Amino acid sequence: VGSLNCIVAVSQNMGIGKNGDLPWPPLRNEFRYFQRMTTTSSVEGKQNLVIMGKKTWFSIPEKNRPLKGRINLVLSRELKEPPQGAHFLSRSLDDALKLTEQPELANKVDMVWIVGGSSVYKEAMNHPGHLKLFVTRIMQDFESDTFFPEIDLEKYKLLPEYPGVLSDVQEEKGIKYKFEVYEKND
Numbered sequence: 001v002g003s004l005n006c007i008v009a010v011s012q013n014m015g016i017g018k019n020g021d022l023p024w025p026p027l028r029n030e031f032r033y034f035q036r037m038t039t040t041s042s043v044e045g046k047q048n049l050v051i052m053g054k055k056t057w058f059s060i061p062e063k064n065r066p067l068k069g070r071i072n073l074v075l076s077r078e079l080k081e082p083p084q085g086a087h088f089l090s091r092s093l094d095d096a097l098k099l100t101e102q103p104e105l106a107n108k109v110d111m112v113w114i115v116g117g118s119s120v121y122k123e124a125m126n127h128p129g130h131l132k133l134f135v136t137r138i139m140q141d142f143e144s145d146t147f148f149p150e151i152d153l154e155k156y157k158l159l160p161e162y163p164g165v166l167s168d169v170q171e172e173k174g175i176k177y178k179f180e181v182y183e184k185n186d
Ligand SMILES: NC(=O)C1=CN([C@@H]2O[C@H](COP(=O)(O)OP(=O)(O)OC[C@H]3O[C@@H](n4cnc5c(N)ncnc54)[C@H](OP(=O)(O)O)[C@@H]3O)[C@@H](O)[C@H]2O)C=CC1
Pocket: 007, 008, 009, 010, 015, 016, 017, 018, 019, 020, 021, 022, 052, 053, 054, 055, 056, 057, 059, 075, 076, 077, 078, 079, 090, 091, 092, 093, 115, 116, 117, 118, 119, 120, 123, 146
């Protein structure tokens, strides 16, 4: 795999989770952005792959698992098969990336999206080569118990804009946020 993508929504105090859910009330269009970015592939015959940790999998409501229109892969060091409804299980990110090149997934996977949580992001962000980080900055503090790893600015550059990503401050349910895209190359 020549490139990876991470996608996250983070509060101003770097929070991503609280009590097995998001720290902030649900933001419908922010969720639709996540859906659009992770689902969309114009390569006929392929789908995108989402990679997530075990707690993130179980944080998705049952009726919405697996995430529709995407191949769902869960990371765990302890499970011996995928959680019910998930398509694949790997012991690490590198194992997961190697899996996509074996006969079953060889001709089936377009983009790879890392969707959290903290340890999944941390590993992905140090993976060699080209990686983009799609980061929604929720412009408020929220009490959180799970946090997004620091963005190494020696490695990552904030892109001034990105095709298909809105540049202006957004607002839903009185909460302001903005969409950012970062990239590293080495
Ligand atoms: N705001 C946002 O964009 C997002 C928020 N969330 C929130 O974050 C919380 C869940 O995330 P978090 O608590 O960090 O937990 P994770 O989803 O990262 O799950 C942790 C478990 O996943 C497995 N795991 C995680 N990383 C790896 C790794 N790199 N290699 C192998 N296995 C791995 C382990 O399972 P095992 O113990 O079985 O080995 C580990 O105990 C929830 O509150 C959720 O709502 C989650 C994603 C994004």
